[PDB]
């Protein structure tokens, strides 16, 4: 059985996600507009989408049970290293295998491979990112599993610069155990086959995506004319030490 504490963890994470993820994508109107006619025409829009998403990921992270017991230093390290991975994870909710795109409610806000190419990223990132999105979709995760996976992603003790690794691991383990118990109690066969193992493999995939994104971000942001198109928060999270 799920203990009362594990039920509590799931309830909090579900609510946390509901309060930081608007499935009507209403705030997207406030971004610099998408331009699809190179020039890097989709950079301003997608920089804004990333920057917005970092803010939401932070607001989610703050609500993870136990995250509050960490020092601000370790909070910072964990969010800086995980932000791009959690954006990739949370984006799965908009991703559709119908046409391999992220569909955020209208044609203006529907992003395919070519749109992502127009923000300065190459297929070395984009092809594995799409493959990641497909594999994750095909897991058909319950919202409960999805929010737990994002929370486990964030509280990872192996991130460079973590000072109190044991406390981070303890926090993570509580979430991992909740996830494993949830799958056993609430996810019916056959969907549940090796489900936990497959979810953890996604976290490994995310490390490789993170590293490639970092390489490409370093390249993109080296030119002051592209850096100019980013946001202050993106420059701080992706660029600072």
């Amino acid at each position: 059985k799920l203990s009362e504490e594990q039920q509590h963890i799931i309830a909090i994470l579900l609510d946390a996600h509901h309060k930081t993820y608007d499935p009507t994508y209403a705030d997207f109107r406030d971004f610099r507009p998408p331009v699809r006619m190179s020039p890097l025409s989709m950079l301003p829009h997608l920089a804004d989408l990333v920057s917005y998403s970092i803010q939401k990921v932070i607001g989610f992270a703050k609500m993870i049970p136990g995250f509050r017991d960490l020092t601000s230093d370790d909070q910072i390290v964990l969010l800086k290293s995980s932000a791009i991975e959690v954006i990739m994870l949370r984006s799965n909710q908009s991703f559709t295998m119908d046409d391999m795109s992220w569909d955020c409610g209208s044609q203006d806000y529907k992003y395919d491979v070519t749109d992502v190419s127009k923000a300065g990223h190459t297929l070395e990132l984009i092809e594995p990112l799409i493959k990641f999105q497909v594999g994750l979709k095909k897991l058909n995760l319950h919202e409960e599993e999805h929010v737990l996976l994002m929370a486990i992603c964030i509280v990872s003790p192996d991130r460079p610069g973590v000072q109190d690794a044991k406390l981070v691991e303890a926090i993570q383990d509580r979430l991992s155990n909740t996830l494993q118990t949830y799958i056993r109690c609430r996810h019916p066969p056959p969907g549940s086959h090796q489900l936990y193992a497959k979810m953890i493999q996604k976290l490994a995939d995310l490390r490789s995506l993170n590293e490639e994104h970092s390489k490409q971000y370093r390249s993109l942001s080296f030119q002051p004319e592209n850096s100019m198109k980013l946001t202050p928060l993106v420059l701080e999270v992706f660029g600072n030490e």
Binding site: Q55, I58, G59, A61, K62, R68, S72, Q75, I76, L79, K80, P232, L233, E236, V237, N240
Partner: peptide, 11 residues
Amino acid sequence: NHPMLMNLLKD
């Protein structure tokens, strides 16, 4: 330094 992240993370 991460003043924006620290701000957003604040209680």
